[PDB]
Symmetry: D2
Subunit: 221 residues, 4 copies
């Protein structure tokens, strides 16, 4: 199945997306920092999600959090998460070039009550996440997002940021994907409420031109 992934996605995307539909998602992505690809808005065909899930549960059995270099050992994940077809398509949503170049990958695995990935920003512009396994909404695990913010590393003022803004909450079901503007959207996961609530996330980090400019200047400018 390898190397044919490109044609498989180019066909799937071309059949399911008009340019106008992509521009509506671009509007939503700019407004909210967040686009969810659920069963009503698939971006990757179901067979490849089951495959990526299979690869992730295998890497989880040798962890919980799986660090980037371990995740990078999967050839399927590298092929999908760097597919020029997928990156070009998603740049219609970001309305800017995506640069798939560090901590490139990560697999979170939550299970015990109060499991959380607390409020934070990331140093890169984009997060492309696969919610391979998600507990029911009542068990927690939703993503929460505060767009149009920024990380002041000398005084992040997370709680004062919440007082100035409204929090969006996104429920996820197993197999959902989502794109996040991870540098200006403060985000977190909702703590798990039960033990035995399995939450497995593949996180993929990409850059924009602004992230290359920050590297070249060593400065937020």
């Amino acid at each position: 199945d390898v190397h044919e992934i490109d044609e498989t996605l180019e066909k799937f995307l071309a059949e399911n997306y008009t340019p106008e539909r992509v521009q509506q998602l671009a509007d939503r992505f700019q407004r909210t920092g967040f686009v969810k690809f659920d069963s009503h808005m698939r971006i990757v065909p179901e067979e490849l999600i089951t495959a990526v899930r299979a690869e992730a549960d295998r890497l989880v059995r040798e962890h919980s959090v799986v660090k980037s270099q371990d995740v990078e050992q999967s050839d399927l994940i590298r092929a999908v998460t760097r597919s020029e077809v997928l990156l070009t398509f998603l740049a219609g949503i970001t309305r800017e070039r995506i640069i798939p170049e560090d901590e490139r990958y990560l697999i979170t695995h939550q299970e015990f009550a109060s499991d959380t990935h607390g409020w934070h920003w990331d140093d890169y512009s984009f997060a492309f996440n696969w919610a391979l396994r998600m507990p029911p909404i009542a068990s927690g695990g939703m993503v929460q997002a505060v767009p149009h913010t920024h990380w002041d590393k000398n005084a992040p003022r997370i709680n004062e940021t919440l007082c100035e803004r409204q929090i969006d909450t996104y429920g996820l079901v197993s197999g959902d994907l989502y794109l996040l503007r991870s540098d200006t959207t403060m985000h977190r996961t909702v703590p798990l409420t039960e033990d035995g609530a399995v939450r497995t996330m593949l996180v993929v980090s990409w850059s924009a031109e602004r992230d290359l400019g920050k590297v070249l200047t060593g400065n937020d400018r």
Copy 2:
């Protein structure tokens, strides 16, 4: 002071509120379920807040001592709070209640099932989402930790408590959360039956949070009990 309290409050409110300001607050209360009375919007003069804080501190210390002397987050129950003449006077003031009814835009009935008229909570160590059974909560944030330590109030207005399926997390997925920072001495009025609300957990021991909570009914709550 006794009936001097009502005279003090009437003069303070008359000196500080225009009809237009009251209507602006009423618009905010309908829109958000929440109105904060802070240093830029006092409703009770600062001298009375200090006195109410002293009374709440006394009740908390006495409650803690009595508990220690019997049993070996503290919560002062309604009947114990009610014994404070000062707290009873300010929180049942005809002047304050009538003023606030201009913001609720409906009658406030200072009657609730006795066990939940009043409450004082005092939190000293790091330690959820709900609705109440009555329309109004009038809360005195007598002592608040830094915003950075937590303790904010969060609110989701225009919701409802389905007692058979509360669906808190599904409600969060459909709505946006508002967060309100408080500092010591702030008061707030909350539409507690249609605003899903919680206290933000404190994330640091030694952050002290002392709240006086007062529950009031509206006409809908009387009817609900009757049917």
Copy 3:
């Protein structure tokens, strides 16, 4: 049909609404001042809408003829609309009113000063922001032009009419405007005393807009008159 109307409406509502759906609409009505009953949320069956549209068309044509025969945007006044048995039956239906009171979460009183119980407007040529004096407007968008021609409803909830200084444009600067597209046959319920609202101007001759407007009171409107 006569009392067959109430039986038809009861069965239609019972078949199409769960308690959870009604509470969701009540949450939306409190939050936005507005609930649209469109093809995905019918409240009156389509056959009755067609019949009400035919009656409104008749009243408009008869009104226009009578005016032409005396004098040489048409507006059918309340007393003339009231003569339609069909329109009177559907708009005063105990079944419909009781159902909608689940969305308002308060009693609906189908009484208003007689001159403004009912209204039919009919607009045929290209041609403002206000509040009403009563809590509820139940509107039948019987004929609507394309959205591109205008005719939407815009709304700013959680406001109030200061009759001495309405300050429409200053209100707009403080709030966000909601816009609702309508197609022929849509109905909507509006909290007309706290939602500043307008019809979007039609920007094309030959775009036809026919509306049946019904005003209802809440308990606050009875009290307001009495005081």
Copy 4:
């Protein structure tokens, strides 16, 4: 006074703005498409606004709308609206390079009832506008804005856009300036309600890198 404008603005901005304040305005600009520089948030000292006003009323006396090449004849307006100090400062708000390069300038002048500049988008990323004269709010003339939208030139669907979004309204007083993200914020002016309501606007259009890329590709990509 000419040529000293740079130092005059560099001093004024450095005394009145911390980097943190600029980043809060950046957050607001991304969220809303709109930052207002009123008496509480001046960007240009009062003496230069009175001067620019003086120049604009003169150009208005020989118009109403004053086209770009006529406006360009004013040396003061060119100096201020291309000041490297101002452009560099404002790029802290846009969080991207501003390119002051076509219809570079425009002076609208409204006066009779129902005067309006109807709903539209612009072809450039930024509008830097000077509300030199504004009637009272009750006479109209406010700016209205719908951010996170886009101009589909084959079917702009303005009214359907309003049905999907909320409208922001910004009141302006004489001397207010504002920065607008003019390509993704649908915008208009509120029609004047009285005759003799004088509304004089200087509009300055700037590009971003995305606008140069659209030129080079002839395409929205």
